[PDB]
Structures are given as C-alpha cells and as structure tokens.
Enzyme design. Sequence first.
Site, short mmCIF file in Angstrom:
data_model
loop_
_atom_site.label_atom_id
_atom_site.label_comp_id
_atom_site.label_asym_id
_atom_site.label_seq_id
_atom_site.Cartn_x
_atom_site.Cartn_y
_atom_site.Cartn_z
CB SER A 219 -12.97 -1.71 -7.00
OG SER A 219 -13.42 -1.02 -5.86
CG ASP A 242 -17.31 -6.51 -4.97
OD1 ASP A 242 -18.55 -6.71 -5.02
OD2 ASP A 242 -16.68 -6.53 -3.88
CG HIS A 297 -14.04 -4.44 -2.54
ND1 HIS A 297 -14.94 -4.53 -3.58
CD2 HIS A 297 -13.25 -3.37 -2.81
CE1 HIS A 297 -14.71 -3.56 -4.45
NE2 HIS A 297 -13.69 -2.84 -4.01
N1 LIG Z 1 -4.49 -6.19 -4.04
C1 LIG Z 1 -4.88 -5.12 -3.97
C2 LIG Z 1 -5.36 -3.76 -3.88
C3 LIG Z 1 -4.53 -2.74 -3.43
C4 LIG Z 1 -5.00 -1.45 -3.34
C5 LIG Z 1 -6.29 -1.16 -3.71
C6 LIG Z 1 -7.13 -2.16 -4.16
S1 LIG Z 1 -8.78 -1.79 -4.63
O1 LIG Z 1 -9.62 -2.84 -4.16
O2 LIG Z 1 -8.75 -1.48 -6.03
N2 LIG Z 1 -9.23 -0.45 -3.83
C7 LIG Z 1 -10.42 -0.40 -3.04
C8 LIG Z 1 -10.32 -0.71 -1.58
C9 LIG Z 1 -10.57 0.69 -2.02
C10 LIG Z 1 -6.67 -3.46 -4.25
#
Ligand SMILES: N#Cc1cccc(S(=O)(=O)NC2CC2)c1
Length: 371
Positions: A219, A242, A297
Amino acid sequence: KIPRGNGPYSVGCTDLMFDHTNKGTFLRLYYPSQDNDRLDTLWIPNKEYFWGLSKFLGTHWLMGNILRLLFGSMTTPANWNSPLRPGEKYPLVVFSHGLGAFRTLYSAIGIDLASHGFIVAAVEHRDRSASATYYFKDQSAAEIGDKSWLYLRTLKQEEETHIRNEQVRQRAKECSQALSLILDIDHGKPVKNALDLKFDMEQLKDSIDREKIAVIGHSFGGATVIQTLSEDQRFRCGIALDAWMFPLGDEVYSRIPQPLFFINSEYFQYPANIIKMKKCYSPDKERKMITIRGSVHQNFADFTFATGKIIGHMLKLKGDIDSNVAIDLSNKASLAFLQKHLGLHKDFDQWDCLIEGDDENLIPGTNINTT
Ligand SMILES: N#Cc1cccc(S(=O)(=O)NC2CC2)c1
Ligand SMILES: [Cl-]
Ligand code: NA
C-alpha cells in the site's frame, strides 16, 4: 492463525531499535533460526497500538480497549529471540508497512520469506503514517523504558498531496537507514539495542549476503519501495504489493533503474493508480505485474487471518479467494522474482510461471482498463 512459513527453515523473530530516538531505526526482524522450541511472538505487543488502530478507524479510543481484548494475546508463529541459524549468508528484505499499519502486521510475509532463508527487516515508520509507534526522548528514558508514543496524523484535504509526498520521502530514508544499520551490524559495529531483549545482535555479524538486498512493501509501503529504489541503488530490486501510488512525486517515475514487480489485488485497484504504475515502465526496464483473482487490499496483511471467514468478508479483511491461497501466490511469485533479480542459487524458479500470472487464480497484468 497466521500461517507458518512454507520453507525449509525454522523462523525466529526479534525487535531492534537503534538509536533510541524518533530519528533512529525501529524494525521487527524475521530470520532463519537455529531452534524451534521458543515462545511464539506476540502479534500486537502494546496496548497503544490498539489505541492507534482505533484512531485510524475513526472510532472512540475505547474501541481500542475492545480490540485489545479481542486480539491482544494473539501470537504469530515465529520463535521469539531464538538464535540465528548459523553457517550461511542470508539475503535481506527491508519491508515497508501501509497507512495505519505498523511493523508487526506483515508476519505472514516476513515469516514465509524467513522460512526460505531471508532475513527480513520490517521497519516501523516515524512519519506519523503508522497507527502508532514509539521511541525514547533521551538516554535516561530508554534505560528505564519510559516510552513516548507517536500516533497517526489525520490530514485535511488541502494537506494530502504535500504531506503524503513528505511522508514517502521520509519512509524511503527510513528504509535506507535501516539497511545501513543492518549492514553495519553485519560488519561488526557494536550496537546496543535500545530495547532490552535477549537477542544478541553480534549474531548477525557476517550473516548478510551484502549485495542481495531487496525492498518490499504494501500500500503506502508499495510507494515506499519505489521511492526507495529511486534514491538508494543498494536495493537491487523491489516488489510493490498493491501499491498506493498517490504519494509519489512526478520526478520518481523515470528514475527507477531496478527491476520492479507489481503484485495487485483484484478489488483495490483503480485507473488513476494503474496509470501511475504504468508510468514506471520503459523498454530498458524490467517490469512485471500480476493480479490475484478474488483478492482484496487486506489479503497482503495479517488481519486477513485474524477473524473468521464470514466476519472477515464483511469487514473486507478477506476476499472471495482463500487467504492462505492468496498469500502463498504473492509470496511464491515474490520468491521467484527475488531469485531472478538477486541471483540466488535456490529453487524459487519453480514459481517462475507465477511472475507471468500463469495460474488459475492469477490474472496476467491487470483487470483494470485505462481508457
Ligand atoms: N493488517 C492490517 C492493516 C491494519 C491497518 C492498516 C493496514 S493498510 O492496508 O496498510 N492501510 C490501508 C487500508 C488503508 C493494514
Ligand atoms: Cl522462549
Ligand atoms: Na540515497
């Protein structure tokens, strides 16, 4: 349960903070371990991470207390502070977490990489993109364990472009700094871990295959891979899980000479993001892209394993695809890519077909149309 690694090596885990300050490096280390009779590793190790998660969700802080009740005793299958498996030099992955995440939430990936003979340094970013993180104000505070906590920064729409770019550049710097620390420990520099843990850092001396370095992340961490590559040629390739591309400055796109692998989920991606990924392409550059069918995601992070199937799908922690199946694909494809571009002499080329998205649960390239 977060799955065990699929590789032949037992897995150890520990934490390193050096220096103790908010400008120091903080990482969770996953590594091939000598022994397999240690206590498993506490998954989310402080109450303050739950308060962080609650702010990230936009709920009252007492949702944090409830999260802690639900998940605060949960472990991940790595042998906490186990001795390093000796007699072999290990390639190194620096791993970058996403927005609202922190260092401990990608153990499924870190464990599996470790089980195949990687040392993995999952950094904790101090850019206020972590739900929470901590450090010590000075040497006195570190001695007595008086932690200062730094929580997620929420942005006004007017701040997004600027502050997200400042953050990704800081993230990049934290990846390069984390590499330098590990390489210096490899080269025997005494380092007093600011955390008082029974894992002697001198074990890592002469344990890193010093040219075989990669950067991986999810991310916001996927943008961090790319920024990192553009500014630190010591990283020999990157894998962007991703990636959220918005933080990147216009300048970086033409400035990534290293091989780069995009591993996407089916349901996260969108044209603006895909267009940015395609700006990383040129004929002289090695670029690969795959999309995991039926995935979301969250399939790249550990909370995909933390709840049941039903509640998992409701909260978008799980997709149509089985979580273990999805992460096996991401991890095996990553292994094949790393072997190709780090010049490893293992058997990870058995998964070369996954790099090209040749699997019934893979889509070559992307499902997203950009006209
Ligand atoms: N497990 C887990 C986890 C916990 C908090 C945030 C994430 S993220 O995908 O980096 N953040 C994206 C969704 C906005 C993943
Ligand atoms: Cl133990
Ligand atoms: Na640099």
